[PDB]
Design an enzyme around this catalytic site. Structure first.
Site, PDB file in Angstrom:
ATOM      1  N   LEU A  17       0.397 -11.870   1.614  1.00  0.00           N
ATOM      2  CA  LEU A  17       1.825 -12.140   1.512  1.00  0.00           C
ATOM      3  C   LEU A  17       2.429 -12.115   2.904  1.00  0.00           C
ATOM      4  O   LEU A  17       3.370 -12.849   3.150  1.00  0.00           O
ATOM      5  CB  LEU A  17       2.509 -11.128   0.603  1.00  0.00           C
ATOM      6  CG  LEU A  17       2.020 -11.026  -0.849  1.00  0.00           C
ATOM      7  CD1 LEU A  17       2.813  -9.967  -1.566  1.00  0.00           C
ATOM      8  CD2 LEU A  17       2.152 -12.298  -1.656  1.00  0.00           C
ATOM      9  N   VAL A  18       0.503  -5.720   7.465  1.00  0.00           N
ATOM     10  CA  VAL A  18      -0.003  -6.698   6.493  1.00  0.00           C
ATOM     11  C   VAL A  18       0.362  -6.295   5.063  1.00  0.00           C
ATOM     12  O   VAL A  18       0.285  -5.123   4.706  1.00  0.00           O
ATOM     13  CB  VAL A  18      -1.533  -6.830   6.606  1.00  0.00           C
ATOM     14  CG1 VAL A  18      -2.061  -7.872   5.631  1.00  0.00           C
ATOM     15  CG2 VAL A  18      -1.940  -7.159   8.037  1.00  0.00           C
ATOM     16  N   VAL A  19       0.730  -7.285   4.271  1.00  0.00           N
ATOM     17  CA  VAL A  19       1.111  -7.071   2.874  1.00  0.00           C
ATOM     18  C   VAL A  19       0.311  -8.046   1.991  1.00  0.00           C
ATOM     19  O   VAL A  19       0.199  -9.219   2.303  1.00  0.00           O
ATOM     20  CB  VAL A  19       2.625  -7.238   2.671  1.00  0.00           C
ATOM     21  CG1 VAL A  19       2.978  -6.974   1.213  1.00  0.00           C
ATOM     22  CG2 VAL A  19       3.363  -6.281   3.607  1.00  0.00           C
ATOM     23  N   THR A  77       3.593  -0.923  -4.204  1.00  0.00           N
ATOM     24  CA  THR A  77       4.926  -1.118  -4.786  1.00  0.00           C
ATOM     25  C   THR A  77       4.970  -2.247  -5.790  1.00  0.00           C
ATOM     26  O   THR A  77       4.008  -3.026  -6.000  1.00  0.00           O
ATOM     27  CB  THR A  77       5.982  -1.427  -3.721  1.00  0.00           C
ATOM     28  OG1 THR A  77       5.680  -2.716  -3.159  1.00  0.00           O
ATOM     29  CG2 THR A  77       5.977  -0.453  -2.636  1.00  0.00           C
ATOM     30  N   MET A  80       7.121  -8.588  -5.944  1.00  0.00           N
ATOM     31  CA  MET A  80       8.338  -9.416  -5.927  1.00  0.00           C
ATOM     32  C   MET A  80       7.959 -10.840  -5.536  1.00  0.00           C
ATOM     33  O   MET A  80       7.841 -11.166  -4.371  1.00  0.00           O
ATOM     34  CB  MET A  80       9.315  -8.799  -4.928  1.00  0.00           C
ATOM     35  CG  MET A  80       9.746  -7.380  -5.329  1.00  0.00           C
ATOM     36  SD  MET A  80      10.707  -7.182  -6.799  1.00  0.00           S
ATOM     37  CE  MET A  80      12.239  -7.902  -6.234  1.00  0.00           C
ATOM     38  N   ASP A 124      18.685   0.816   7.013  1.00  0.00           N
ATOM     39  CA  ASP A 124      18.424  -0.501   7.565  1.00  0.00           C
ATOM     40  C   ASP A 124      18.626  -1.584   6.532  1.00  0.00           C
ATOM     41  O   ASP A 124      17.830  -2.515   6.379  1.00  0.00           O
ATOM     42  CB  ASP A 124      17.016  -0.600   8.192  1.00  0.00           C
ATOM     43  CG  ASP A 124      16.860  -1.820   9.088  1.00  0.00           C
ATOM     44  OD1 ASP A 124      17.860  -2.441   9.465  1.00  0.00           O
ATOM     45  OD2 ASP A 124      15.695  -2.203   9.284  1.00  0.00           O
ATOM     46  N   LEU A 145      12.684   3.847   5.192  1.00  0.00           N
ATOM     47  CA  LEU A 145      11.397   3.779   5.871  1.00  0.00           C
ATOM     48  C   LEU A 145      11.477   3.787   7.376  1.00  0.00           C
ATOM     49  O   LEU A 145      10.539   4.203   8.024  1.00  0.00           O
ATOM     50  CB  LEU A 145      10.616   2.547   5.405  1.00  0.00           C
ATOM     51  CG  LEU A 145       9.544   2.817   4.356  1.00  0.00           C
ATOM     52  CD1 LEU A 145       9.117   1.509   3.734  1.00  0.00           C
ATOM     53  CD2 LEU A 145       8.296   3.449   4.954  1.00  0.00           C
TER      54      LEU A 145
END
Ligand SMILES: */C=C\C(=O)N[C@H]1CCN(c2ccc(C(N)=O)c(Nc3ccc(C(=O)NC(C)(C)C)cc3)n2)C1
Length: 252
Positions: A17, A18-19, A77, A80, A124, A145
């Site tokens: 998507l 690092v993710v 998580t 999305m 943020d 975060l």
């Protein structure tokens, strides 16, 4: 494993998507954030993750757990599927109606009212830190975060933050107003012709963003109310929610 800990052996990686997008125990969609070595204050973050496990709201991206026994550590998580709100806003193909934009504002405001009820600051808030799911619902991500990060968001900060580093609920309010401006501007950079340094000067001189073309007067009044020079004269998230609902009822 503690109740905040996920076994990474239960993850299947499906795409970058690092993710990454993956599945937990074959069936449940997740996003998997790989925390780069040296980037995060990890033991502090882990302690905070235990608290974050208990935050739960439909408009807040859910934290499912963390994988901390190896490096890099993983943050697991809610997935999305439509990605970050900033990029979503910038896609002209969507041809958004203003009612859709107002609903994105309401989604974030409901998440922030929830965080405020728990005395939790985002620190943020910005369109780049909101995500969009497969149903077009916007949710707030990465709340808190920044505290564990070892590029300051000048353009989302109130005067007292820029001058004195005074963070509060009211600095999140200010940021929310800038986020409404980002939504109604279809993802334009706030103060787009200015540098960060010039933006800080502009704000300190008491000047502000001005009305996006897609914002009605009543919507502009709501975002502008977040930018009072006096923090204590800015609304709460609960008040902002009531204002947004009133406009939805009037502009329906
Ligand atoms: C605008 C900021 C940005 O690009 N941020 C990236 C860093 C963190 N990102 C992230 C974090 C968490 C999730 C999640 N919970 O699902 C996602 N999800 C995600 C990202 C991108 C895409 C995507 O690229 N979609 C299109 C349609 C191909 C554009 C989908 C899901 N991202 C992203």
């Amino acid at each position: 494993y503690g109740s905040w800990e996920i076994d990474p052996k239960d993850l299947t990686f499906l795409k970058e998507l690092v993710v990454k997008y993956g599945k937990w125990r074959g069936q449940y969609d997740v996003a998997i954030k790989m925390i780069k070595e040296g980037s995060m204050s990890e033991d502090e973050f882990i302690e905070e993750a235990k608290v974050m496990m208990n935050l739960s709201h439909e408009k807040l991206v859910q934290l499912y757990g963390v994988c901390t026994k190896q490096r890099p550590i993983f943050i697991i998580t809610e997935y999305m599927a439509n990605g970050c709100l900033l990029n979503y806003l910038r896609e002209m193909r969507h041809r958004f109606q203003t009612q859709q934009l107002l609903e994105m504002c309401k989604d974030v405001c409901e998440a922030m009212e929830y965080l405020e009820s728990k005395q939790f600051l985002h620190r943020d808030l910005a369109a780049r830190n909101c995500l969009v799911n497969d149903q077009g619902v916007v949710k707030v991500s990465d709340f808190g975060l920044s505290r564990y990060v070892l590029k300051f968001p000048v353009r989302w900060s109130p005067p007292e933050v820029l001058m004195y580093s005074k963070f509060s609920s009211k600095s999140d309010i200010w940021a929310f107003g800038v986020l409404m401006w980002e939504i109604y501007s279809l993802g334009k950079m706030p103060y787009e012709r200015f540098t960060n340094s010039e933006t800080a000067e502009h704000i300190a001189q008491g000047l502000r963003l001005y009305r996006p073309h897609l914002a009605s007067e009543k919507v502009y009044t709501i975002m502008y109310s977040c930018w009072h020079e006096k923090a204590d004269e800015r609304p709460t998230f609960k008040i902002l929610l009531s204002n947004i609902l009133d406009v939805m009822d009037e502009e329906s």
